[PDB]
Amino acid sequence: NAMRLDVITIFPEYLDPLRHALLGKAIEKDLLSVGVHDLRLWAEDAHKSVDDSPFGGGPGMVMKPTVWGPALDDVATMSVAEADKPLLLVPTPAGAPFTQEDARAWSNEEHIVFACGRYEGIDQRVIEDAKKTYRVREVSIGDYVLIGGEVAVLVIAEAVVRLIPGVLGNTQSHDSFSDGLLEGPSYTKPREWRGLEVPEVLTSGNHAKIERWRREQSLKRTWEVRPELLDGMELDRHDQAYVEGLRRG
Amino acid sequence: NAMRLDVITIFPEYLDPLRHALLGKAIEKDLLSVGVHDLRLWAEDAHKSVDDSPFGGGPGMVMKPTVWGPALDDVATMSVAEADKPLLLVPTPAGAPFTQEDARAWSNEEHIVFACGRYEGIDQRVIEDAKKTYRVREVSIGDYVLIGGEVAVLVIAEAVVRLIPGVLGNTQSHDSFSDGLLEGPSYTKPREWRGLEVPEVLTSGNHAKIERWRREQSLKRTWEVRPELLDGMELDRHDQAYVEGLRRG
């Protein structure tokens, strides 16, 4: 019943946070099992080389199929119709964007393997050949350029594992994007701090007005920061009139 | 001349990867200085409490202004006109998206402080009050929900620090999104592996044809995975005709 994550990387230590904070707690609840594997275990030469110059010339290095292929073959055997193949996630800025829908889908997986790139990335034939053994997804965490895939593993792992029942715990298991909108601001005690008062509606005890305030603040934050998300929705008169009030200042 | 990063968190150990791989090398080149601070140092009660129930009712916990405010005040003094204030980055899924343009801008900063949220996040008054001391940016790394802000610090740090001269090193300092397109696939030796041959143009030595192939493959990957990015560009006849050939199959 535990999700198994296997990560193949030249920097195993980068994945130490998979055993910290909430994911570490998930392991102690038998909800998560983590294996981190040094890609160099599969390098044959004495130099433990994992990369080589790109075909076509040009700078940089590309990771070697003769190392990656055996590594992926071996890790797949660690606890065929497509649905029965394990999932292989390959972080790359040229992959389809990671979405909350992906996180929900992947929370159902029994076994996720991650292939972590560095340098120019992994020879593309590794990804194609891996389809014989895995369901393969290339995935970008956003429109920006990282140094390696390891940090993207940590991102995806957080978003996926927190959707496994029991991981968040009784207090946080109850978010942004859920209804197409960003979440608004939150407040706690004291009522007044450094001259700033919590919105008075929140101390009114009136559940209907508090709930409307929360909706307004979500519309307002979305309008401020991601107004194009509102263009994709049909707002009712209450919400549309509120947003028009923002546009008029 | 070194960029200083200070991170405030209830899980300092999560930031251990700031001293691994390339960022660890950057520290050893005097290009980066990292401080990680336990938020609980600023908790007053014997219980070292950093969070409390939200105003308005409802589940979850919100991090306390009476802990965050002093923490941010103290860390700002660690090596006023707006431009002279340090930059405070506050990861939140309700923040403006992190972009490569942000990464370029922030690579010029002398001092970046990160406030890492957990639970429902940080009382919003902390963010507003912090504007007296910092230039403040709320930033989302993507449209998905994480457990804490620590992993988003690792993401932003990779994307920013790799733009500091000297960090990538002579071999990788020369990417996706640079021209609005995703990068295409890369290949290395051997020419044939598991029945898959590297594209023959790449072994032709013809630089003009190789360069055109690289452009086509970038257009193709973008069309496959992010076709809306092509809608935002005026492609010339060579590129538009190529993409139309993809649409016709």
Ligand SMILES: Nc1ncnc2c1ncn2[C@@H]1O[C@H](CSCC[C@H](N)C(=O)O)[C@@H](O)[C@H]1O
């Ligand atoms: N936005 C992103 N999402 C997921 N992984 C990323 C990423 N940015 C970089 N990476 C990881 O970091 C590695 C090196 S960056 C590869 C850079 C390439 N020249 C390009 O710009 O397309 C990638 O192979 C991938 O594993």
Ligand SMILES: Nc1ncnc2c1ncn2[C@@H]1O[C@H](CSCC[C@H](N)C(=O)O)[C@@H](O)[C@H]1O
């Ligand atoms: N996409 C994202 N980008 C940056 N930080 C994120 C993030 N998702 C979660 N976080 C971090 O994780 C913390 C807890 S998640 C807060 C969840 C909130 N109820 C909501 O859905 O809006 C946030 O406060 C932030 O620090």
